[model samples]
Target chain A: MKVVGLDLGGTKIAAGVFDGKRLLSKVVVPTPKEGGERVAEALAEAAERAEREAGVRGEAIGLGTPGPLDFRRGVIQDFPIRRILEEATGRPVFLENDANAAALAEHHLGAAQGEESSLYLTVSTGIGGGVVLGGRVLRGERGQGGELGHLTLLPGGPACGCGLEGCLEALAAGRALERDATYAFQRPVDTRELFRLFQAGDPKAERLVLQAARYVGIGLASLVKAFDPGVVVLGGGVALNAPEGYWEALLEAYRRYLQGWEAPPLRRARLGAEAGLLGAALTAYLEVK
Target chain B: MKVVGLDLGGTKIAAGVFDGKRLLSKVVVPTPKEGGERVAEALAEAAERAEREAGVRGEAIGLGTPGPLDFRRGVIRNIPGVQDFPIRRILEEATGRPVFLENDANAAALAEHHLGAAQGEESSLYLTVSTGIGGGVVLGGRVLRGERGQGGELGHLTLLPGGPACGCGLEGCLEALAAGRALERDATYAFQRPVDTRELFRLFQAGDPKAERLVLQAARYVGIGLASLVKAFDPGVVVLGGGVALNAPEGYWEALLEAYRRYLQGWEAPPLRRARLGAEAGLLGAALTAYLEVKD
Candidate 1:
């Protein structure tokens, strides 16, 4: 079951030819910022090149795109990239939320492979989550389940891009980290630089990082209470690169809010950047199976 | 297939004989406060009375009880006197039929899913905002019993950061702020007049600002808890049950909708409706479970 998996991100596009168990070939390219037919062509070309390099023609193509997508229709409703890619590649392309794809990958072959239920939390520019329950990805009637980031952690606390106030994403994501750092230092400092300053023993940076971690921990606590998944896998740039104290603060906050129930075991994501590609490929395999 | 369904509560016990489609006969009695053999006997007697009135023998019996239960093992953990109570064995011996046990809320959810507000919905949340807030999640047309059979514990989610203490020992939980007990506590303390939930709503209707504020505040907290459930499960509908939701003033629902919209994070609010089956939901659901188990 050879398939081409395309991981389309905001800044870059990565594709790979997968032969069920392993990647035969891979390619990476910058995503066209304009997001029209040009971006679709790039995706198609990358898939073609990967398949040609691997010397294995793909049976189908699976795409992982940043969502609010129409998973049932296999379309990116906001971006409208599916039809163009499908046309250029002349192959059936299956579309899924990138976070969901990554969760599938982790649940199938990565950190949570053996768990009956698992939650994948990505703390990037904005928070996102994916859930697999009873060894099945939870897709509601409209494929809108597992929107964990949108849960309100504080009523009327902070404004979110989703036009809601006090969402977990607004309080605990990388964007929140930047916002808090800018407020504390009276200057804009990105998450990377904030972490660097924290590692260098800057008091303000340390406070900001711990604050962000605590908020994330609180959100995780809510998730644990709601889903009660066996394992919670933390991913994305902010969670994967955080220092030990950041995780310590997170665990501390988690414990405080846990009431009496035992918290699920937490694990750092194992697949790293390749997770989306592998997951997208697996999606194609599973769809056919 | 005729089945007997029992709804077991701390204060009362209700039983009905059903023929898969509708109840043939029903009976209710006060629960024996002193548990043990007395409670078990009461359950058996109720089932026998219902069956006698219906003029039919039940092939199986189903019971719904308060939980923190071992649903798989049919054991009630927290309820005293019912400790290690062989409920299945006792009921089967008394009624000469097979027995099934389920959490009361989950059974209500199943009943709603079968023929009520949640019909045709892929996923639905049934919340009973009563003495304490309890919830049940129906996903993919089946009850989702999580690892500990306690997945839908919506009451414990933190709504107030460091506010009132909850029975679950959590500070600022939805249950602590919005349950009937909370309403009674707040109204009694603030007005210096002990008023039940019904009386509080009546006061609100009579232009009492304090009553309105208290009820509206509780509804807002419930909306917040519901919003959290919506985000986590993406259910197509949310069914409101229990005395508080059923008897709320129109303004209470409007305020709840507004709060839910304010916290929805741009997602559409799932259809919210009062549960249709009312108190009879648990009995019907328990009967359905017994029937389904027999068919299987």
Candidate 2:
């Protein structure tokens, strides 16, 4: 069940060999700034290096791409990725959206491992989530399903990158936290310094951080009303590494919001930053198994 | 490929034999108030009567009951006679045919997705705004029953946090803000009299500012709730059922659509349609439940 996973992001690409449990012989390389052809060659070369280091040939290759953007041109293209990698590497290549790949990775090998259904919400630069049910991502009719970031939690509350008001991202994302903190402190406050202030019990920073954290909980609780998943896996650097009180506040709000309803267990994502790579691997493993 | 659908309500029951396209020889009878056993017998009798009238026996039976079903244990929660009873096994024995169960809302969603308003679509989300609000999600032609049969409970989505208390004990639920009883509750309180949805709508149509405000606010919340749900299910179409919303004034619908379109600013909004099955969707969808299950 060994598979090679290629996690292609905007800045870097991670290639690794996975044994259904652990990622082995991981290789990180800068993504080619050239055409799709060069990106494909780099992807092929990275897999070879990973396989050589692991001393094992991968049965299949899982390619986790940044959707629509990847298929456009430059880095990757509308030019068939699966076919190119399939011919270059001479193996079956399974493609998956990067976000969905991470969701699958967490579901199969992380916090939601044994659950029948799980929801993964990552809260870093922006908020995003995926619903995995019966071990499959619930990609809706228009590929807009699991687009949990832009849900209007507060109309006219905060502006979002999506141009919507009161969206989860606008209200709870790390960027949102920085935006509010910068305005509240009347200075250019970053997330790291904001968490520091909260940890030191600064009243203004405490209020701002705890308020944003509660919104994250509220958003997850709202999603539960729709999916009723088995477990909710919270991830991303901002949430997982937030101040201790911030996580507690989030749990408190999540519980309060779900009063009188069956509350699903909320767990932190276990896969760390390697989730994308492992998730990409699981995409192919689950598909071909 | 005829199947029988049994729609169980607290006071009444409707049974019909369906031949894939339509429900023929429909029978309506009072649900027995005595016990679960009597209810099972009544359901079996009604199914037989429908079959006799149709002059054909159904191969399977579908039962639609109040939601939060115990799919694994075959028990119906939130219902009167059959509460926590093994109705699935009992009904299967009584009718000599396997019975498939679906909640009332999910069954309606399935019916609408297959043969009603959302017909020909790949998937759909169904919401019924009645005395209470209920939701159903039909994806790839089957209901998403969830791990604990709680999936598609869209009514409880918190649209206005800290707004109102919901029947489910949550605050600011979509049902609390936008359901039929919510409209009646607010209208009655505002006028300091007993104002039902019917009167509220009449007042709204007459352009009473207060009444218009209450009705229009509820309509907007419904639109916002549905739009929020699109980020979760992203169904091809949204089908709205229940008498409260369907019979609302034209202005109510206009506000709802305006809010729905407004909320879905950047994302493509799914086409929202009125549920076409009326009261018959439960039975039709219940039949579809068995029809879909047994055939597979």
Candidate 3:
């Protein structure tokens, strides 16, 4: 059950040939900036290259793309992707949102291994999430299920990318942290600088970072009440790589919010940077299996 | 095939013989206040009474019990003595048939999905705004009982951080601010009397400013909590049940619906419907619980 997994990003395309357990071979290529069609062509080439490097042909292709995914229309971020890739590569292309694909990977081979249900949260420039139930994503009626980041955490806290106020993403995401940090520091401050300041015991930076971490923890705790996944896998650049005190504050809030309720085991994403590619591959492999 | 469904409530026990679609016969009796053994015996007798009334005997039975269910051991964790009670084993032994268990709130959620307001929907989220806020999620017509059987504990979610202290010792829980108990807590402390929902609603209806403010605020929180749940579940429909929400004053309902619609500004809002099964939801859902599983 070898398959090709392609993680589509703005600047690069990460393609890999995956057997059941791990990636056999992988390749990275520049995302074609000329046109959307070339991007598909580039993905097909990368898939071919990875399969060649692995010395095995993939049976199908899995594409992990960022959302807003409308599975009903077979589109990701607003255009036909699955059909286009399938026509170009002469193989079935299984498409999943990057966060969802990562969740599937985590549930199967990463931190949530051996768990029937898992909740994965990725806190980068924006926050994204996926809910895996019984070995599959809970896609819901219109494919809007597991849109966890948009949940209203603080009713009137801040405006979100989704045009809402007080969303988990609005209050806890990397961009949110940077926005608040820059405003508080009265200069252009990014997450890296904020974390440095926080580690250096700057009260303002520490307050800003810890506040965002609490929101993340509180948001995850709220989602647990609804989904109750066996494990909660926290990942993405900003969350997993945070300062020690940030993790402490987040866990404290999570436990505090979940007081008198069952708190599932919270773990870090074990797959690290490879989760995206592995998850993309899983999306296709699971489809066929 | 026919099966028996028993809804175990605090004050009374409801039993019914169900034939797939609806109940053929039903019976209600006072819950045994003496001992746990009498309660099990009463359930068996009630099941037999329903079966006898229907002129047919059920092949299996389903019991809908509240509280945290340790499903593996067939125990209910919330009730006084029911904690150590092997309810499924006792009920099965008494009735000479196999038995299944479901959370009462989850049973109502399943009933609503199969026979009530969300009859044809693929999935549904049900919330009971009663003495305490209880919730259940049903997907593919099955309850999403979490790994630890603590799933769908929606009331415990931190809706308003630092808002109010919950009985669960948490601050700002949805239950702390929006449940009937929460309303009464505020009303009693505000007016300096033992005011229940009934009295408070009358005041709300009479345009009492303090009552109006308290009731509408709670209603809005319910809407907000449901909206937050929608983002997590995105169920096909949402069913709001229990007497407090269903019988709230017109202004309360308006504020709830308004807040629900406003909060779902960028998302597709599911149809929020009243619980149609009413009192029968628990029993019917319990029956369906057995029917669905046993049939499978």
User: Candidate 2 - CAPRI tier?
Assistant: medium
lDDT of 3 by residue, B82-111 (tens): 657888898877788889999999999999
Model 3 complex DockQ against the native: 0.81
Predictions' DockQ, in order: 0.62, 0.73, 0.81
Q: Tell me the spans in candidate 3 whose CA falls farther than 4 Å from its real position.
A: B78-80
Question: Tens digit of lDDT per residue, candidate 1, span A135-226?
Answer: 66786656778887887878868888888777888888998889988888898888888888999999988887887788777778777766
Question: Better model by DockQ, 1 or 2?
Answer: 2
* Alpha-carbon runs more than 4 Å astray in model 1: A77-92, B1-3, B17-21, B44-60, B78-80, B89-98, B192-195, B291-296
> Candidate 3 chain A — worst ten consecutive residues by lDDT sum?
A70-79
Native interface contacts kept by each candidate, as a fraction: 0.61, 0.74, 0.81
**Weakest lDDT window of 10 consecutive positions for candidate 2 chain B:** B75-84
Top model by lDDT, which number?
A: 3
- Per-residue lDDT of candidate 2, residues A1-289 (tens digit): 7999999988899999998889889999999887878988999999999999999999999888765323232123567778778899999888777777778889989999999899989898988878898788777887677888877788668878876789999999999999999998999999999998988889999999998998889999988888889999999999999999989999999999888878999999999888989888988888778
- As for candidate 3, its clashing pairs are none
lDDT of 3 at B259: 90
Candidate 2 C-alpha lDDT tens digits along B87-206: 899998778999998999999999999999999998899999899899999987899887767788989988787688888988788899988999999999999999999899889888
lDDT of residue A31 for candidate 2: 95
